[PDB]
Symmetry: C3
Subunit: 171 residues, 3 copies
């Protein structure tokens, strides 16, 4: 089981900020999973071609059953993570953005400003998350319960979870 | 006249709990006469497109409902075929169907179901499981008789005691 | 100074006689909200996709409207092309807006799912499709306007200020 983790951010990629977002993803997936898995981690600038390049590499060459991104989903000019995700996917999963936004609105009205989306590239699920750790955990909690079954639907690795933390639904 | 399309990758002879749940629900809803135009077909994007086109253009179905071919596997190509034959999409349908379906089947977020209009016909993608089909229709049908009204199609009447459609 | 575009999309309102309650309702609502100075950039136009595009383009690009709200032309009838025009002039969509407006309208009217309104960015201008009824205009705006001043700060635009007794915008520290 390989899961990709992409932090998208000029400042985090500069070695300016410490990367609290990519931290929260790895730590969350660690609380979630009891099966064996391998984190493939990268921090990259707000550059669309680079986002597209690094998603293709993880999915095509490294067999990530799942890639999660953080950053680059708001209305700022340089936020292009969703455009990059749309470009490298062959089909979109509109239910992910819908739910992540609906959950985040329990917290902040500005949840409607995220353009986060999800889609499939071959047998890889790609899911965009926002920058803030608290939002990361809340987005993953909303959406993760359905991810293992998605992977099984494309005959990928059988992800098993610590059920006291996250409960995967398999019909 | 309502079209019902089962998109499955079997192989026709089997009982089809998807199609009958659609027929049963429409039967509970409506107090006016209607004719189901039923087809089962493979998940081949051409065959789905062809079927939808025939029901809308040639057979004049006011509503066409699909079940199947809407999930994440590569072969699930129902939403693709629906966008192919429709000239305008209705984003509200999918949002509401997923948001009601996921109250019970958390994996409803994996559905790529959508809806749109081909000329005057409304096409709606539904999921495979009967209980989900019923949830999806309970959420959206209250809008459908008005929508058909605006397409100057037939005036569908409901048993107000099972479902209350809105006519502003 | 904030410039806000208001576009009324109606064959019959632009023919002229035939006064525009729905654009007035939008301007009224924005005055209810704002305590900071703004200018409304207002136009009434026909249900014609090329005229809609041309208007949205001028407002965003020449008139430097930081927010543009449209009213009319988002139902299932084939002459309703405001969403098509909006999609054509925007570089990226804001799907949170359509989702929420429809979910807020569903509280009142089952038929909110027939609405095709959307929202998007053209450069640094936000464009939002509103419904036609004055009361629905107010309910859609109450739902989305709390995100809009922060959205505009993120686009390096003017700092909008609100009357908190009326509307509470979130800006994260």
């Amino acid at each position: 089981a390989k899961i990709g983790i992409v932090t998208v951010s000029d400042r985090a990629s500069a070695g300016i900020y410490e990367d609290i977002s990519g931290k929260a993803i790895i730590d969350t997936l660690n609380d979630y999973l009891t099966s064996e898995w391998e984190p493939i981690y990268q921090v990259i600038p707000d550059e669309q071609d680079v986002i597209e390049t690094t998603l293709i590499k993880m999915a095509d060459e490294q067999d990530c059953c799942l890639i999660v991104t953080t950053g680059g989903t708001g209305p700022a000019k340089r936020d292009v993570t969703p455009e990059a995700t749309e470009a490298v996917c062959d089909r979109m999963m509109p239910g992910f953005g819908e739910l992540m936004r609906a959950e985040s609105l329990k917290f902040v009205p500005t949840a409607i400003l995220s353009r986060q989306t999800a889609g499939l590239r071959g047998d890889s699920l790609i899911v965009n998350l926002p920058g803030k750790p608290k939002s990361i955990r809340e987005c993953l909690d909303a959406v993760f319960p359905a991810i293992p079954y998605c992977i099984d639907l494309m005959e990928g690795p059988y992800l098993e979870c610590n059920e006291a933390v996250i409960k995967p639904f398999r019909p």
